[PDB]
Amino acid sequence: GPGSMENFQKVEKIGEGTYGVVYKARNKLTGEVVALKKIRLDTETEGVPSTAIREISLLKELNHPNIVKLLDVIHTENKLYLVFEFLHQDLKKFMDASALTGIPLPLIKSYLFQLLQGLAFCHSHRVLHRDLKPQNLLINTEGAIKLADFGLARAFGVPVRTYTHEVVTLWYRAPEILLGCKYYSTAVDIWSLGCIFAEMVTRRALFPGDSEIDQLFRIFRTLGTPDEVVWPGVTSMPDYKPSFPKWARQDFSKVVPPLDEDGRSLLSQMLHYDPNKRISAKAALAHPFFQDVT
Amino acid sequence: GVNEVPDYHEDIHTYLREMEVKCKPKVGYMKKQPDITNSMRAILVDWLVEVGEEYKLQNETLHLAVNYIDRFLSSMSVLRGKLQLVGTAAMLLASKFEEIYPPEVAEFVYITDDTYTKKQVLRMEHLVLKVLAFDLAAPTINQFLTQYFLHQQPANCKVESLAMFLGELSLIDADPYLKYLPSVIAAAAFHLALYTVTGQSWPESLVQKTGYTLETLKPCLLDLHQTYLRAPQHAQQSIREKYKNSKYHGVSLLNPPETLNV
Ligand SMILES: CS(=O)(=O)c1ccc(Br)cc1
Ligand SMILES: CS(=O)(=O)c1ccc(Br)cc1
Ligand SMILES: CS(=O)(=O)c1ccc(Br)cc1
Numbered sequence: 055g056p057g058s059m060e061n062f063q064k065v066e067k068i069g070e071g072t073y074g075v076v077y078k079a080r081n082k083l084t085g086e087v088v089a090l091k092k093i094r095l096d097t098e099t100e101g102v103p104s105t106a107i108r109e110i111s112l113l114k115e116l117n118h119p120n121i122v123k124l125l126d127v128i129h130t131e132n133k134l135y136l137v138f139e140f141l142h143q144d145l146k147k148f149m150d151a152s153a154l155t156g157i158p159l160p161l162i163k164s165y166l167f168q169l170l171q172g173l174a175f176c177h178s179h180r181v182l183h184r185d186l187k188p189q190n191l192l193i194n195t196e197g198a199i200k201l202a203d204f205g206l207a208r209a210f211g212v213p214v215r216t217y218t219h220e221v222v223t224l225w226y227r228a229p230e231i232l233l234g235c236k237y238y239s240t241a242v243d244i245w246s247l248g249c250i251f252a253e254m255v256t257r258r259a260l261f262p263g264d265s266e267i268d269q270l271f272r273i274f275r276t277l278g279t280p281d282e283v284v285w286p287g288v289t290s291m292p293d294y295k296p297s298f299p300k301w302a303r304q305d306f307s308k309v310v311p312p313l314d315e316d317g318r319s320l321l322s323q324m325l326h327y328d329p330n331k332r333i334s335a336k337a338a339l340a341h342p343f344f345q346d347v348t
Numbered sequence: 349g350v351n352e353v354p355d356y357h358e359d360i361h362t363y364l365r366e367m368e369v370k371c372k373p374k375v376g377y378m379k380k381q382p383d384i385t386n387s388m389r390a391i392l393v394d395w396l397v398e399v400g401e402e403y404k405l406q407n408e409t410l411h412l413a414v415n416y417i418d419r420f421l422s423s424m425s426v427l428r429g430k431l432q433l434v435g436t437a438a439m440l441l442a443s444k445f446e447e448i449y450p451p452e453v454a455e456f457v458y459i460t461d462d463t464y465t466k467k468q469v470l471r472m473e474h475l476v477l478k479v480l481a482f483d484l485a486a487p488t489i490n491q492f493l494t495q496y497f498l499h500q501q502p503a504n505c506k507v508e509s510l511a512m513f514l515g516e517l518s519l520i521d522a523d524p525y526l527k528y529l530p531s532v533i534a535a536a537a538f539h540l541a542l543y544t545v546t547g548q549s550w551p552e553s554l555v556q557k558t559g560y561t562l563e564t565l566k567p568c569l570l571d572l573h574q575t576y577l578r579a580p581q582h583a584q585q586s587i588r589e590k591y592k593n594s595k596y597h598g599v600s601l602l603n604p605p606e607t608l609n610v
Binding site: 095103114115241 | 349350351352353355356357359360361363364367406408440441444445448450452453466469470473474477478481482483484485490491494495498
């Protein structure tokens with residue numbers, strides 16, 4: 055990698071993770087503002103963390119305008135520094151601090167269209183993200199939004215095999231994960247994006263559960279308790295229980311009232327129970343909801 | 349359905365085809381290695397098959413590790429005393445990339461019978477990472493096989509397991525297999541497995557997908573065919589032992605066909 059720390063001037067802390075801290079920094083030679091993610095290997099008895107091996111290996115190949123760019127990796131014997139393109143904010147802080155009276159539909163459609171672009175590009179390169187949530191979506195001053203934080207990401211085979219079950223922050227986690235399915239696929243990222251879409255319109259989480267069973271129940275009370283008709287195989291799934299309350303599917307205009315017919319349509323297809331019928335990012339880009347996108 | 353990524357398999361296949369060329373080892377690296385030979389590498393890889401079996405690792409992990417190893421030995425010259433260290437760090441990196449539950453570093457130290465230290469394994473991991481520049485998402489034979497399998501009419505587990513087996517055998521022998529891309533060995537393996545079990549041949553649908561024909565596959569097939577006939581005689585036997593297991597339908601016990609009529 056063509057970098058060294060001598061050339062960066064740290065500016066402030068901007069975040070912190072399980073393997074290190076992130077600083078906003080400035081390249082003293084080019085002027086470029088970056089985000090430096092430090093991963094301490096000296097405090098590690100197990101060598102380079104797997105999260106970091108996956109983040110670097112996969113982001114090095116994922117070059118897309120709607121995916122945060124890994125600019126460089128500085129690999130000392132005690133510290134590993136990931137140099138990232140810097141974006142001034144995440145979608146969550148934006149929803150809270152400034153989207154108080156709401157996010158205008160133009161910007162929501164623009165954001166969602168860009169998120170789908172980024173995610174389609176991931177899926178086209180056999181990468182699941184597996185942690186899409188507003189905190190992990192970076193926005194700049196120019197109106198770009200970008201997938202970020204690829205530490206829970208995974209390179210998949212076709213067809214997929216069984217991967218880690220402990221995946222996706224709970225509120226954003228797909229039913230097929232919640233029901234302990236042996237296999238999950240690209241549909242889990244679409245689910246997350248669905249939850250995010252709804253969240254952008256309401257500025258509140260769609261399914262704010264406090265446990266796996268509570269999360270399922272909130273999903274069921276909103277979309278109805280799935281049966282063999284809406285989702286073949288569901289009642290065979292490892293954590294499906296016949297004792298599950300059977301709630302009725304509520305009309306979708308009730309789930310997100312301010313949403314127009316096109317919005318409702320797209321959202322219903324992102325939140326389809328059956329992962330096989332759930333819309334792909336690639337197909338979603340052509341949905342009528344985006345006909346007027348900037 | 350979605351588990352076979354219907355809206356992405358082609359994009360993925362094309363992208364894997366591009367990546368295998370970039371992740372390709374130098375075909376003639378062993379002649380430039382002063383102290384190691386194809387025979388030593390065969391011993392190493394056979395051992396990694398055993399390690400994979402012992403720790404119940406995914407076959408993909410095995411393939412990734414071999415990729416890491418050959419690519420490393422393509423630019424870094426290594427004394428025979430150190431070859432196993434390279435291989436250990438390779439398996440560790442491939443495990444951390446591919447496994448839900450990788451073995452701990454200590455278990456890797458343990459399987460080398462304290463030839464090497466934890467410190468040595470860890471330092472080699474950094475070195476390998478430096479040499480490969482963290483390019484670890486490498487296309488494998490398996491990645492192509494599992495896609496080719498979607499073209500069976502109908503699916504046949506004996507076909508699938510025998511193809512996996514044959515592809516695994518190719519990992520052992522740098523000559524000749526270093527000169528074929530994963531996608532091509534996978535093709536040869538798939539055709540040979542299919543022919544062996546059902547008498548059927550490389551499907552036209554896979555001609556459409558891959559642009560490969562029995563014509564373009566012939567060189568690898570003739571090599572793979574020989575490798576399969578000679579497999580009971582090979583110095584290295586861990587793959588055959590592994591593929592006796594019911595997990596893999598005992599496919600190593602099937603008889604190779606004597607001719608391909610190709
Ligand atoms: C240090 S390295 O060669 O592994 C590397 C990896 C990723 C980037 Br982006 C730059 C350099
Ligand atoms: C490590 S990451 O990809 O989440 C990230 C976080 C914040 C910024 Br600003 C850039 C990159
Ligand atoms: C041929 S050798 O003696 O160098 C060797 C290579 C790999 C292992 Br594992 C053991 C021994």
